[PDB]
From a paper:
The [name]-1 Env glycoprotein is assembled as a trimer of heterodimers, with three gp120 membrane-distal subunits and three gp41 membrane-proximal and transmembrane subunits. The FP is hydrophobic, largely disordered (Guttman et al., 2014, Kumar et al., 2019), generally but not completely conserved in sequence (Kong et al., 2016), and essential for virus entry because of its critical involvement in membrane fusion (Blumenthal et al., 2012). However, bnAbs PGT151 and VRC34.01 were found to interact with the FP, as well as other components including complex glycans nearby in the gp120-gp41 interface (Lee et al., 2016) (Kong et al., 2016).
To facilitate structural determination, we synthesized a peptide mimic of the AMC011 FP, which consisted of the first ten residues of the gp41 N terminus (residues 512–521, HXB2 numbering) and a C-terminal His6-tag (AVGIGAVFLGHHHHHH). We determined a crystal structure of the [name] Fab in complex with the synthetic FP at 2.76-Å resolution. The [name] CDRs H2, H3, and L3 form a groove that accommodates the FP in an extended conformation. The electron density for the FP is well defined, and all residues except 521 are visible. The FP extends along the length of a hydrophobic groove in the [name] combining site and is stabilized by eight backbone-mediated hydrogen bonds, thereby forming an antiparallel β sheet with CDRH3. The A512 interaction is further stabilized by three main-chain hydrogen bonds to Y91 of CDRL3 and Y100K of CDRH3. The L100G-V-Y-Y-Y-Y100L motif of CDRH3 forms intimate hydrophobic interactions with the FP. The side chain of CDRH3 R100F forms an additional hydrogen bond with the carbonyl oxygen of FP G516, which is further stabilized by interaction of its main-chain amide with the backbone of CDRH2 Q55. Each residue from A512 to F519 of the FP is buried by [name] ranging from 30% (V518) to 99% (G514) of the surface area, while L520 is completely exposed, suggesting that [name] specifically recognizes only the first eight FP residues.
Numbering used by the authors:
A (entry chain F): 12 to 16
B (entry chain B): 1 to 212
C (entry chain A): 1 to 52, 52A, 52B, 53 to 82, 82A, 82B, 82C, 83 to 100, ...
Amino acid sequence: HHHHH
Amino acid sequence: AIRMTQSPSSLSASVGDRVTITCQASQDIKKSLNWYRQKPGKAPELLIHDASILQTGVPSAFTASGSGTHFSFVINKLQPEDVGTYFCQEYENLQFTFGPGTKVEIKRTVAAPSVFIFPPSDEQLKSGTASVVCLLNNFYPREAKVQWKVDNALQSGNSQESVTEQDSKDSTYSLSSTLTLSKADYEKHKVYACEVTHQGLSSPVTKSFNRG
Amino acid sequence: QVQLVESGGGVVQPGGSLRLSCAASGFAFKDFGMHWVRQAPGKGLEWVAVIGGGHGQHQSYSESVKGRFAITRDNEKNKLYLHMDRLRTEDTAVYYCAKDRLGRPWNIGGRLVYYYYGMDVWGQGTTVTVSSASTKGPSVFPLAPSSKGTAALGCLVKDYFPEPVTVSWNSGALTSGVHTFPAVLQSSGLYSLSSVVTVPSSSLGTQTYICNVNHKPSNTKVDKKVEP
């Protein structure tokens, strides 16, 4: 669940 | 016996950028390394073998290099179709141990979700259960919140969510929420609504219906 | 041209037995070693077993699998087999057969040595689910498009066990705008899934839309069409 920029 | 690591774990990049990912081995594995790609829901396909050589029939869209314990894999210019997970695997062993994978998503402009609401079908009310479905279509970024209300009363513990993977063409996400109740208490209330909060909405979007 | 097709997957009791087959075509199957690799529902790729190509016996296993699975082959039939006994909960996975780039042996230094170089072609994979739970076919309900211009309509596949369920639209003729969501496991112990598609709003009266859902542990094919 990587949070984008 | 050989532990393989990859960095980063997951990344976001812009379309047209060149993306570099690294693989490392516990011990020297010489140049016995392969690079695989797995698009969401498809099987792996081998992109690079013997550390640096491109596989036959695959386009010249990737480069790779490395030796000993350090290896690098590069997408020359990233495209929306390249979302997925990139694995390295060693074959200096008879264990053929894979790396943990590197997840590649792509960053795009903010897009607010399109909300739809679907009432329980007449067929399912035969069964005595009622499933109301809320759909959040083609949004970005991935974070979004759905809240179910019945007669303007918030619900908890009786709904479940699911999110698709990043779309291969327009790089958006979609979410489906299912609110399940029994027909008996379903017919006890009148208005059913799903309220959506997203980074692209100034205020929550409420889509709702009545049993009639 | 080079094709690997898996078969034999399905549900099996824990401690039960099951055998997987992999039909190969488009290359000299006898001349290459072959692998079985598995992928759990929430984990990465994990190598399971290998059989050597050419003339003579060589098979190798992973620690998680050694002594309980067997890898065999039939070069006349162009077939690869994975015999599975004593199966465990952790064995629940999608199983790919895969071709090695080489894998045949060489007589070197008075010894026989095999050179495996990893997988270069994979099949689509077959799902093996180990559980004591009952297999249940899904009930399929429409998600009708509202007449209240883009419209959304879908298919709710509910209370089935186990995974996986396949859903297509208009027998594969309709692919754009389709979003089949990951399945969710309810407190029920049974799965539920949704398949959605967006269409021009004009099309609701003109164009027919049917979801084609398959649950092959059930042998249930259902075609349900979505009307306003």
